[PDB]
Coordinates of C-alpha atoms in Angstrom, one line a residue:
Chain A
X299 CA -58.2 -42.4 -40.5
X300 CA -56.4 -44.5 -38.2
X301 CA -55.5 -43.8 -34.9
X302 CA -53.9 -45.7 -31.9
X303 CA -53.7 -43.7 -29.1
X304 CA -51.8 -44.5 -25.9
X305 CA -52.0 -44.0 -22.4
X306 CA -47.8 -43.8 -21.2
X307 CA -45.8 -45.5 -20.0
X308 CA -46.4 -48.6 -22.3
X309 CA -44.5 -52.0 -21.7
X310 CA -41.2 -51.3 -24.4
X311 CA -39.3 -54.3 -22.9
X312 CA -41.9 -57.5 -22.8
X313 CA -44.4 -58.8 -24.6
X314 CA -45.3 -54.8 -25.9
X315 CA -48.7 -55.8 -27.1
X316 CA -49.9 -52.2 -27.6
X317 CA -46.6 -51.4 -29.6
X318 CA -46.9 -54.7 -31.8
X319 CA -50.2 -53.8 -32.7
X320 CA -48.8 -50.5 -33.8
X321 CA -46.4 -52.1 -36.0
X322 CA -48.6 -54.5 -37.1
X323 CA -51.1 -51.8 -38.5
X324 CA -47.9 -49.8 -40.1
X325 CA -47.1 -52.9 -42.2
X326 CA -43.6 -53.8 -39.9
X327 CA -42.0 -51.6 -42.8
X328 CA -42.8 -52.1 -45.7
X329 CA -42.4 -48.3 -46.1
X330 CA -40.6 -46.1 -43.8
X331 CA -41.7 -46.1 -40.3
X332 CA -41.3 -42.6 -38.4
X333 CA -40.5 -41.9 -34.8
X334 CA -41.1 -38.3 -33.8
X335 CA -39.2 -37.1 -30.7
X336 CA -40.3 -33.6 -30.6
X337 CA -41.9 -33.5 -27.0
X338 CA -39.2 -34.9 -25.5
X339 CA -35.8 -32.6 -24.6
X340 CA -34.4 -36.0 -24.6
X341 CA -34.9 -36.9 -27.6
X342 CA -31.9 -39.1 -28.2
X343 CA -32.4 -42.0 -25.3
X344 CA -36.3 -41.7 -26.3
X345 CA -35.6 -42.5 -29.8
X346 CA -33.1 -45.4 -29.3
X347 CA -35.5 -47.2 -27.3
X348 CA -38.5 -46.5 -29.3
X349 CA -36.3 -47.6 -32.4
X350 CA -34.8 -50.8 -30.7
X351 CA -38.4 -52.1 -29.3
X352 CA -39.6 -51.1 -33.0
X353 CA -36.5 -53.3 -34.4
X354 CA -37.5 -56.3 -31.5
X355 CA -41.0 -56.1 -33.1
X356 CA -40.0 -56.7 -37.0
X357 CA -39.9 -53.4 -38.5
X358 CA -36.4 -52.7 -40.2
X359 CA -37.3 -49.4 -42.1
X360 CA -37.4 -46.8 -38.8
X361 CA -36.0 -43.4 -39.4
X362 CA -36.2 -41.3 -36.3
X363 CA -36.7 -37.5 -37.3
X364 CA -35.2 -35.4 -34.7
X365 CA -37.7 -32.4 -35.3
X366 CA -36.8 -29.8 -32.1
X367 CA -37.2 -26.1 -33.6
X368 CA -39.7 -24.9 -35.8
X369 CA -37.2 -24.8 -38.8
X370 CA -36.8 -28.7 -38.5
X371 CA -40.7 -28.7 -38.5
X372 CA -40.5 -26.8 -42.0
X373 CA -38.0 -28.7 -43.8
X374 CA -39.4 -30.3 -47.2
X375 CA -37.3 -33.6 -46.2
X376 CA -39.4 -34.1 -43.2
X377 CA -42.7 -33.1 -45.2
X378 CA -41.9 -36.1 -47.6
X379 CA -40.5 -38.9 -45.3
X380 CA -43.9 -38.4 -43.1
X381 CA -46.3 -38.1 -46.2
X382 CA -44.0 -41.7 -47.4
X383 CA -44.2 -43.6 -44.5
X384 CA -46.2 -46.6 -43.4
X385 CA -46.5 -44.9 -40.2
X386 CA -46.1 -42.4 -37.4
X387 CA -45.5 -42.6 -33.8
X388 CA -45.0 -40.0 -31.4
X389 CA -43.2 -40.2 -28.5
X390 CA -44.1 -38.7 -24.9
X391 CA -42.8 -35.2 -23.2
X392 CA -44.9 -31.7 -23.1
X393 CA -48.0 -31.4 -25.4
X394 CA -47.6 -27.5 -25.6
X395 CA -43.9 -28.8 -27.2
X396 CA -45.6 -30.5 -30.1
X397 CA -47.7 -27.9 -30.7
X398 CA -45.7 -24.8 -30.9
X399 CA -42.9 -26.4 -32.9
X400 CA -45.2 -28.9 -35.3
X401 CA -48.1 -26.4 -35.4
X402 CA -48.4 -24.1 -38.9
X403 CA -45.6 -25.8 -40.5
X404 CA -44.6 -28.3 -43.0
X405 CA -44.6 -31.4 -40.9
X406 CA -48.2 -30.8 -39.4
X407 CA -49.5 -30.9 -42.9
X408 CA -47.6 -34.1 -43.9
X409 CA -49.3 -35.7 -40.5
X410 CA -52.4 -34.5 -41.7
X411 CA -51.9 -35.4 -45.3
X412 CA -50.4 -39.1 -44.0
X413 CA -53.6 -39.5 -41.7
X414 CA -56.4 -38.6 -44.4
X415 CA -54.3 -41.9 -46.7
X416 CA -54.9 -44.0 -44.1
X417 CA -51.2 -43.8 -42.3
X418 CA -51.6 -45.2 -39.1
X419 CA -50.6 -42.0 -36.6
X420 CA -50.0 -43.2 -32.5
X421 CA -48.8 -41.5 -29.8
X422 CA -48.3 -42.0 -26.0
X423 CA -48.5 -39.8 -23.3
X424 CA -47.6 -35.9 -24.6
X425 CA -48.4 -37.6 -28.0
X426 CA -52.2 -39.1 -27.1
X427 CA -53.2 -35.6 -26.1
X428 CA -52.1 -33.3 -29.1
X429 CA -54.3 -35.8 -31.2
X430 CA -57.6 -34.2 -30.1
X431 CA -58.6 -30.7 -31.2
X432 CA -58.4 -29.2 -27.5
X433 CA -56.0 -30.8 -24.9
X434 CA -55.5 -30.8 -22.0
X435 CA -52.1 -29.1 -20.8
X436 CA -50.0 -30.8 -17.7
X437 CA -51.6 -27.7 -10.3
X438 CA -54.7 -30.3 -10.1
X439 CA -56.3 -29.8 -6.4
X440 CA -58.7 -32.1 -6.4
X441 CA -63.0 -31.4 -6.6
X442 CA -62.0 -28.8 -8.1
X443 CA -61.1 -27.1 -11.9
X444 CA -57.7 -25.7 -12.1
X445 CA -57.6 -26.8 -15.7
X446 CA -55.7 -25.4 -18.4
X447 CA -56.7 -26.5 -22.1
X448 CA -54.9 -25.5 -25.7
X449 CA -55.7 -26.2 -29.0
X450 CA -54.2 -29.5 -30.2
X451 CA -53.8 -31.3 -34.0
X452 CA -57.2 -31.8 -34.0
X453 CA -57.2 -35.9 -35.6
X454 CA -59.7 -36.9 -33.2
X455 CA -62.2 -34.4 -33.8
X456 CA -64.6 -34.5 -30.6
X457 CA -63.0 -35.9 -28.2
X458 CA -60.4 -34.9 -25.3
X459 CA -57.8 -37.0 -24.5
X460 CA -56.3 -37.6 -20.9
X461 CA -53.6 -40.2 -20.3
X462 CA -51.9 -41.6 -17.2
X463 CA -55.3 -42.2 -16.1
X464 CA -54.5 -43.7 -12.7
X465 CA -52.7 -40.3 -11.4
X466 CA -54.5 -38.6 -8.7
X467 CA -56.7 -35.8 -10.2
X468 CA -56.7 -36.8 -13.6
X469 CA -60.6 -37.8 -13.2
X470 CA -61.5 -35.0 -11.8
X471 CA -59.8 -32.8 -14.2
X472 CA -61.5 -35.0 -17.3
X473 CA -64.6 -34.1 -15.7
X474 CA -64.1 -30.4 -15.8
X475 CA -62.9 -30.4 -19.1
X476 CA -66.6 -32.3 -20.2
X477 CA -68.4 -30.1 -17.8
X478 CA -67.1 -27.4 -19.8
X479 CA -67.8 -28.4 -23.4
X480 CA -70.2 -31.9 -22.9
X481 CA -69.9 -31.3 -26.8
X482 CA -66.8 -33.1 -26.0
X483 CA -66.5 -36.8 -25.2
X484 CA -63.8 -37.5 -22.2
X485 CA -61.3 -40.3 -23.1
X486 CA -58.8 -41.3 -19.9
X487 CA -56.6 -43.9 -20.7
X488 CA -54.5 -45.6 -17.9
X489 CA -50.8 -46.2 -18.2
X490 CA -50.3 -49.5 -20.8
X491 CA -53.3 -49.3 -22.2
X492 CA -54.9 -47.5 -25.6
X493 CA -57.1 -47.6 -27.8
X494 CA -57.3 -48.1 -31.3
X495 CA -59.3 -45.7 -33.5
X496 CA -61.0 -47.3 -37.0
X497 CA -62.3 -45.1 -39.6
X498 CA -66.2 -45.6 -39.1
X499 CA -65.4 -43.7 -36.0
X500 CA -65.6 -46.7 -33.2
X501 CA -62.6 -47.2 -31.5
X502 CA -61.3 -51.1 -29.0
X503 CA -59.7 -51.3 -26.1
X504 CA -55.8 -52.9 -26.4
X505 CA -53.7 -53.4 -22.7
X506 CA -53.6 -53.7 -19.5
X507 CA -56.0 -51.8 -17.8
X508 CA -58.9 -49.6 -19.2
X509 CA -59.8 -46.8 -20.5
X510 CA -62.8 -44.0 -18.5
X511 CA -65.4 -42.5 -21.0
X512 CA -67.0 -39.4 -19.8
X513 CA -70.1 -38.4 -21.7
X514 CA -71.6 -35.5 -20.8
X515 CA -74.5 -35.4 -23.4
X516 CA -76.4 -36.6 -20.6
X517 CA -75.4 -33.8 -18.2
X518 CA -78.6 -31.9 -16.4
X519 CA -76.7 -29.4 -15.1
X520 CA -73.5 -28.1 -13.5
X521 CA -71.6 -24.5 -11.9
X522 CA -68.3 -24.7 -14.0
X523 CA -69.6 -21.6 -15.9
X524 CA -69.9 -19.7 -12.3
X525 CA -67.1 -21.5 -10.9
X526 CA -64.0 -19.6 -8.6
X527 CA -60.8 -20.7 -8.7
X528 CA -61.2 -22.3 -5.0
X529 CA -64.7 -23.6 -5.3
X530 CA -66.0 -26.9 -5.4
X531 CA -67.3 -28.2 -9.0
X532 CA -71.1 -29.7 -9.1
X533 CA -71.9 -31.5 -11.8
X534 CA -75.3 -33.9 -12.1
X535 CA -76.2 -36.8 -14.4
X536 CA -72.2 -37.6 -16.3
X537 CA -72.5 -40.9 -17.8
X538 CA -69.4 -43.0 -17.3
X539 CA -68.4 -46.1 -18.9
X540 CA -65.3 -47.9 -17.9
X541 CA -63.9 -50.5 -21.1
X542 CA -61.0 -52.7 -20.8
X543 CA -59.2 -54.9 -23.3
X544 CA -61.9 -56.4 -25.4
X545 CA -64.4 -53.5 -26.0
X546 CA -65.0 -50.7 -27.8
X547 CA -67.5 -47.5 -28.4
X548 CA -69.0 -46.2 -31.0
X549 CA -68.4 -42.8 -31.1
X550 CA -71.4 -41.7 -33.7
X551 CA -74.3 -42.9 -31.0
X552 CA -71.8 -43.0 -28.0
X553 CA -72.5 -46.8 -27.7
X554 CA -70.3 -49.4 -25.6
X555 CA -69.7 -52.6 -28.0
X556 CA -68.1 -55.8 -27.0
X557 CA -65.9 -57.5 -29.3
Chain B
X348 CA -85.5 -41.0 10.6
X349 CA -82.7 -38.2 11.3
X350 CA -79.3 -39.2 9.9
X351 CA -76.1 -36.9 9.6
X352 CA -73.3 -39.2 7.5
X353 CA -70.1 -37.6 7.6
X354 CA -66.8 -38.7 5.6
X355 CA -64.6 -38.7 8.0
X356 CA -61.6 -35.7 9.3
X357 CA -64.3 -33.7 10.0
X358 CA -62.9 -30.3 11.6
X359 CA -62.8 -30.7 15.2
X360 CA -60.4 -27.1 15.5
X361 CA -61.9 -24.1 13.6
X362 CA -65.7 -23.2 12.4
X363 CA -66.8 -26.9 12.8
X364 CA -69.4 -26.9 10.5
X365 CA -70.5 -30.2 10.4
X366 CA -70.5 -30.9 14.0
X367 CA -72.4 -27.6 14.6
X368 CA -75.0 -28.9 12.3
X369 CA -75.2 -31.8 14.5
X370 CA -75.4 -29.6 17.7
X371 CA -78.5 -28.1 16.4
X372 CA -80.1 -31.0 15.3
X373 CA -79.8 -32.4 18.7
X374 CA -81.4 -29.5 20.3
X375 CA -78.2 -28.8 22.1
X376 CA -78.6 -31.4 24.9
X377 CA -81.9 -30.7 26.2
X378 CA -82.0 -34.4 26.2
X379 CA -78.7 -36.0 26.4
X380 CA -76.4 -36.1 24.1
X381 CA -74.0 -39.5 23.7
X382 CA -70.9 -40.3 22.0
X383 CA -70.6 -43.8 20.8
X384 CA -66.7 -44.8 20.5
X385 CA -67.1 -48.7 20.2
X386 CA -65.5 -48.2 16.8
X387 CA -62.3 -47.1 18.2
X388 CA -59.4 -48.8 20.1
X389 CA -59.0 -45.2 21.5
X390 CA -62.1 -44.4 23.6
X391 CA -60.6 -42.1 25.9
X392 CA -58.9 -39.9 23.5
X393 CA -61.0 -40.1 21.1
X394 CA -64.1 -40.0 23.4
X395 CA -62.6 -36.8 25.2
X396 CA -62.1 -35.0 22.1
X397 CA -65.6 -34.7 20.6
X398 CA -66.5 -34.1 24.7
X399 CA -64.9 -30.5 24.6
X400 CA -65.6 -29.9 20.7
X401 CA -69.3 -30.5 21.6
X402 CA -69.1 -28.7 24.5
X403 CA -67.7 -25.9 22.8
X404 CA -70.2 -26.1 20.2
X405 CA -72.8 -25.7 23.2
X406 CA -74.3 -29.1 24.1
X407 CA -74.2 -29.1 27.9
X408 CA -75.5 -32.4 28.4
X409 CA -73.1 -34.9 26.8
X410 CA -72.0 -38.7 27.6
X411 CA -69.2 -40.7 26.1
X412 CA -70.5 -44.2 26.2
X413 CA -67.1 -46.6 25.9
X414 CA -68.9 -49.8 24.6
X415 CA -66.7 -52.2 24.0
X416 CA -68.1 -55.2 25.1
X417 CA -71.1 -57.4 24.4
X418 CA -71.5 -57.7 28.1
X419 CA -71.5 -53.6 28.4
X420 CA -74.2 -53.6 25.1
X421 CA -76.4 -55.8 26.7
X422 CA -77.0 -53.6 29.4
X423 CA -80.5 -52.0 30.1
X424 CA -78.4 -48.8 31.8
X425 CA -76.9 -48.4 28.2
X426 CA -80.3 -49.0 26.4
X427 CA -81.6 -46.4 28.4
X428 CA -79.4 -43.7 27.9
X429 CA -79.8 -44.1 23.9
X430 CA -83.5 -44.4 23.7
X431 CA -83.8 -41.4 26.0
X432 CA -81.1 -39.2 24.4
X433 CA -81.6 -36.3 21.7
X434 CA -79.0 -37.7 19.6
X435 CA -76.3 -40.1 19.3
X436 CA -73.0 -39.5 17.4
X437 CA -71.0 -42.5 16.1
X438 CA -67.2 -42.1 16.1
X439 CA -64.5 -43.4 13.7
X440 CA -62.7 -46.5 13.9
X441 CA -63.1 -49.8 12.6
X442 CA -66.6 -50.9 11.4
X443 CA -65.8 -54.6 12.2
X444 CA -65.4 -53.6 15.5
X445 CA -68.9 -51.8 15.8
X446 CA -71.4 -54.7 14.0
X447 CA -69.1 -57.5 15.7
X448 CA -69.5 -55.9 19.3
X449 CA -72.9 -54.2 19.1
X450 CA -74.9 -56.1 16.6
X451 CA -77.6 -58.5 18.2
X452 CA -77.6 -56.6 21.4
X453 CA -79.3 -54.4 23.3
X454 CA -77.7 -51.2 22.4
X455 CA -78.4 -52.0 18.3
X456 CA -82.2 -51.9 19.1
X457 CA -81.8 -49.2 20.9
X458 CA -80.2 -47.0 18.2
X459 CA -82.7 -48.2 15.7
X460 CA -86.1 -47.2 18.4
X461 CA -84.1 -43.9 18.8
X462 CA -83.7 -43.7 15.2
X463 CA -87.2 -44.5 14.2
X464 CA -88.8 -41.6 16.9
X465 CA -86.7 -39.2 15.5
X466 CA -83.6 -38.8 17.4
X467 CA -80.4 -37.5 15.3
X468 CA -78.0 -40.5 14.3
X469 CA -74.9 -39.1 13.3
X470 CA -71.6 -41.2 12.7
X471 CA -68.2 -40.2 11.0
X472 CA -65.6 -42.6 9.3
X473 CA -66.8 -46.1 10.3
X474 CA -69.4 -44.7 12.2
X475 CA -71.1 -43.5 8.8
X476 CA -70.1 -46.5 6.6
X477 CA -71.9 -48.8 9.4
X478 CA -75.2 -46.8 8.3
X479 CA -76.2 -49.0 5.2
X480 CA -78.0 -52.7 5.1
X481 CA -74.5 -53.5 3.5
X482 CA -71.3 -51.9 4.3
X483 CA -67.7 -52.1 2.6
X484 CA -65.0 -53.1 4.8
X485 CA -61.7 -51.3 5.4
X486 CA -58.4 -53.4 4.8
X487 CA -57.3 -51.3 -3.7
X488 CA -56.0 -52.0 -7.0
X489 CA -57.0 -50.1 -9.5
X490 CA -59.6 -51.4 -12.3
X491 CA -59.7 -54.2 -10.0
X492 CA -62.6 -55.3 -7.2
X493 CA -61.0 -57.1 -4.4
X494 CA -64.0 -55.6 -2.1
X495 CA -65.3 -56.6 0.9
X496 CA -68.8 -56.1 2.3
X497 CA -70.7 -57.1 5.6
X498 CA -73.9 -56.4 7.3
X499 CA -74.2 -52.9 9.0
X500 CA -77.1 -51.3 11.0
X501 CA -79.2 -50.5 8.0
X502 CA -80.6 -47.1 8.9
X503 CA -80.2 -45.9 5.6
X504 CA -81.7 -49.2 3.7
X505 CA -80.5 -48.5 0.0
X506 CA -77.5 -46.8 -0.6
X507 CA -74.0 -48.1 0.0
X508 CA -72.1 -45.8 1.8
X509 CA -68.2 -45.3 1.1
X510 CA -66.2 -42.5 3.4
X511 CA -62.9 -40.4 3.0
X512 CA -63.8 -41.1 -0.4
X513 CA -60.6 -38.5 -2.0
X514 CA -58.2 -41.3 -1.1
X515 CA -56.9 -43.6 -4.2
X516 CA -59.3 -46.4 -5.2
X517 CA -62.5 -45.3 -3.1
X518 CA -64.0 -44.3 -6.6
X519 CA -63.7 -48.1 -8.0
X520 CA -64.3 -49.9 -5.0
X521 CA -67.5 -48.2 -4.4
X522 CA -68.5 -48.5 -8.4
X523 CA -67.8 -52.6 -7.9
X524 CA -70.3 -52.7 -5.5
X525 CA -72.9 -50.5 -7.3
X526 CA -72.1 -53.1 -9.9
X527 CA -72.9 -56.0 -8.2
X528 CA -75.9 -54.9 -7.2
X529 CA -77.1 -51.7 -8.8
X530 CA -80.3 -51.8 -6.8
X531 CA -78.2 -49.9 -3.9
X532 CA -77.0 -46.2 -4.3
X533 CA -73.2 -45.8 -4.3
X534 CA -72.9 -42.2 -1.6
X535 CA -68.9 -41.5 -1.6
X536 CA -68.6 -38.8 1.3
X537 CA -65.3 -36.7 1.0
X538 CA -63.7 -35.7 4.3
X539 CA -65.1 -32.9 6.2
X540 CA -68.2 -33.2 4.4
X541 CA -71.5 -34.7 4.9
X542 CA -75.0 -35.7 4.0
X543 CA -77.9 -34.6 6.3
X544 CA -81.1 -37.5 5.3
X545 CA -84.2 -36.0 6.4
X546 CA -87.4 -38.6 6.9
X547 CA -88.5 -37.5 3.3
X548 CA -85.8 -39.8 1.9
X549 CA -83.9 -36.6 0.9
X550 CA -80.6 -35.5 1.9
X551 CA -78.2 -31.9 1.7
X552 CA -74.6 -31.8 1.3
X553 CA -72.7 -30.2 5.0
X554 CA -69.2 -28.9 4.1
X555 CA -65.9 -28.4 2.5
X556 CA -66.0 -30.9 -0.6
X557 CA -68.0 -33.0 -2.6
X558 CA -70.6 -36.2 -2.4
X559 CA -69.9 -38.7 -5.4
X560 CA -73.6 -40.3 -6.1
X561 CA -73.2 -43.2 -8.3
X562 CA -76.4 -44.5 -10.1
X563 CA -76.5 -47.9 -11.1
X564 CA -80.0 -47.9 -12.9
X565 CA -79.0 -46.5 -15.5
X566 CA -76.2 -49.7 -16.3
X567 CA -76.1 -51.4 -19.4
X568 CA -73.7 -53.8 -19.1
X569 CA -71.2 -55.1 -16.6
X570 CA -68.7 -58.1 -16.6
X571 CA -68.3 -58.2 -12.2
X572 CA -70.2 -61.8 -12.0
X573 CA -67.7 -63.3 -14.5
X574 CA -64.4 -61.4 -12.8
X575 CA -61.5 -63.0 -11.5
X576 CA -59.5 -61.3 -8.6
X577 CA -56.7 -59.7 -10.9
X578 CA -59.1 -58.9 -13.8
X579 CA -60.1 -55.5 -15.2
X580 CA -63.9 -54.2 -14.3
X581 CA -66.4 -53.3 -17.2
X582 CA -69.3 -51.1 -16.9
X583 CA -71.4 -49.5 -19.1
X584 CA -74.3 -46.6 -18.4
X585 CA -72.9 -46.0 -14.8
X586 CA -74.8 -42.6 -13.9
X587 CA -72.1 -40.2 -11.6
X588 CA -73.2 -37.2 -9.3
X589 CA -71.1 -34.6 -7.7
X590 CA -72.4 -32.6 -5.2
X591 CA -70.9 -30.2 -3.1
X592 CA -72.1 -28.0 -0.1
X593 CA -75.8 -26.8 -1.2
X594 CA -76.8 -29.2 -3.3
X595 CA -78.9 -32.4 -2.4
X596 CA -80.5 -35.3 -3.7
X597 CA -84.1 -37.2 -3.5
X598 CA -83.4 -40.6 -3.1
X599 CA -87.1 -41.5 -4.4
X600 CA -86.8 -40.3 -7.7
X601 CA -83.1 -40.4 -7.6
X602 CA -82.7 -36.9 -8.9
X603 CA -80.0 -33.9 -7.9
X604 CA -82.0 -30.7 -6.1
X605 CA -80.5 -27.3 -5.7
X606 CA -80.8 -25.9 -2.5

């Protein structure tokens, strides 16, 4: 499927490249186009200004679902506008929120269902993490793993996502969360910047600053396993790459492209 | 070729670990032990402080040596107390202030014939980044290089060496400079920890955090030749080390030991 998936706080009041390209892949329409505020406990200033930048940028049919308790989540209407639309974008908040109101109901499978047609699903912030199968959950001293991880929707299927990438800790805690499955690629995206997942499994860089890929394939060896709460984390051979607007990866040989 | 690189805030108060290992390196002050504080606009203070620390630590023979002239590094009285001491300790401060004031005199070359018969070298803050061929310079935006480099002593001739490396941006100024020439070893030193280099080209991690080691080798790609000032680094294959207390590395083969 199709992904874009965002760092935070991206620009809603300029030029909004990453959130035109969003409505450019959902058509600017043509069928419904779906703002999910379910992270948020504000969910009624979140979805007026994700519905007027979305209005700014062209697209007319925007329904905002208010989807806050699990019996929202498992309302038929909901199932159908989401497996209808042209797209879906969910807003920032808590990622545990997501997941223990959208998880085992209705409107999960109607994501689901939408992302295997080729809906475009995006996200930002609390809505960029839920999109890999285990997340990363928002206490980060730093060298060392205080990390807390949860299962997430699982569209990305080997991959954890962090987002505001430029935040103290968030490297290190990326690196533990690799350390501790290098199965897993590390995505960090910085604030204003995502990336925009195709299909054939590569992905390009769109905004402001760049996203940190952490592969751990390469790892020789590391402690995390033996590792105290208060102890430092050693880790030897990580293989970073560091991609701003105008490349992209390949995600099935873990290859750095330039576009 | 003795070297003890320390990242600066080293504990001056409680177990001192660092220090201590550079108490016993120095035999104690059989031979006289000498404090360096060109680096500092604070020689007193900051001279008087590592006097009683080291004093406390048992090294009976100790000098403070307040350089801070040309005049005062060109004299033979000064030569002669490096050359003849078992060890010489480097404090913080500016590194400007040490290459600009001792470089070309007297008291460089006498630090380097020390160095080369053996004699401890040891030098915290600016008195560890001045170690390398090429140092950075102290004056930060993120994804961005706006770094600064300038000759140093070159005791340690391929590695860059980047201190109080937990601060914000340390990470990507250090990784611009392994970029633009990946020949050189990026070391970023935490605070209160340290690297010990013994004469085999192989150095242990001293203290309470972690040693970032940043491999350029192993780098595919990079656009830092083409990059404007407010542009966004890219680098691909960039090989990353952590290494805290126990672990070391062999700079030859550039590969992580366990101690």
């Amino acid at each position: 499927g199709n992904l874009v998936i965002i760092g935070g706080a991206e620009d809603k009041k300029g030029e909004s490249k990453i959130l035109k390209k969003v409505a450019e892949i959902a058509g600017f329409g043509d069928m419904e186009f779906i703002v999910l505020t379910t992270a948020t406990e504000h969910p009624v200033e979140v979805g007026n200004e994700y519905l007027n930048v979305f209005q700014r940028l062209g697209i007319n049919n925007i329904e905002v679902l208010d989807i806050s308790t699990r019996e929202d989540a498992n309302n038929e209407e909901n199932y159908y506008k989401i497996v209808n639309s042209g797209g879906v974008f969910m807003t920032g908040g808590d990622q545990l929120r997501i997941t223990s109101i959208l998880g085992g109901t209705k409107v999960f499978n109607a994501l689901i269902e939408a992302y295997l047609k080729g809906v475009v699903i995006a996200g930002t912030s609390a809505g960029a993490s839920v999109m890999s199968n285990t997340m990363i959950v928002d206490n980060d001293p730093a060298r060392k793993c205080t990390l807390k991880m949860a299962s997430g929707l699982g569209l990305l299927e080997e991959a954890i996502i962090d987002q505001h990438f430029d935040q103290r800790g968030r490297f290190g805690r990326l690196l533990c969360g690799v350390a501790e499955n290098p199965h897993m690629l590390g995505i960090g995206i910085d604030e204003d910047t995502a990336i925009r997942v195709y299909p054939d499994a590569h992905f390009e860089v769109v905004g402001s600053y760049a996203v940190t890929i952490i592969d751990g394939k390469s790892i020789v060896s590391s402690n995390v396993s033996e590792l105290k709460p208060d102890e430092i984390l050693a880790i030897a051979n990580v293989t970073v790459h560091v991609l701003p607007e105008g490349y992209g990866f390949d995600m099935k040989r873990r290859e750095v492209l330039r576009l």
